[PDB]
Design a protein. Structure first.
Length: 64
């Protein structure tokens, strides 16, 4: 459910369940327009990149 299919390395699906360790990592939405973090056990937007150019790594560190 990282992206309903074709998810990236640092891309996650919003309103989706995340891991416990994910709570200490950042991921850029599949739209690459916003950044979401693992909160309350679910991926929630914490930052807005504005443009679809946000890219991160498999280890997190999501950046615009």
């Amino acid at each position: 459910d990282t992206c309903g299919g074709g998810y990236g390395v640092d891309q996650r699906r919003t309103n989706s369940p995340c891991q416990a360790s994910n709570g200490d990592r950042h991921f850029c939405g599949c739209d690459r327009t916003g950044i979401v973090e693992c909160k309350g056990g679910k991926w929630t937007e914490i930052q807005d990149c504005g443009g679809a150019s946000c890219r991160g790594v498999s280890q997190g560190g999501a950046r615009c």
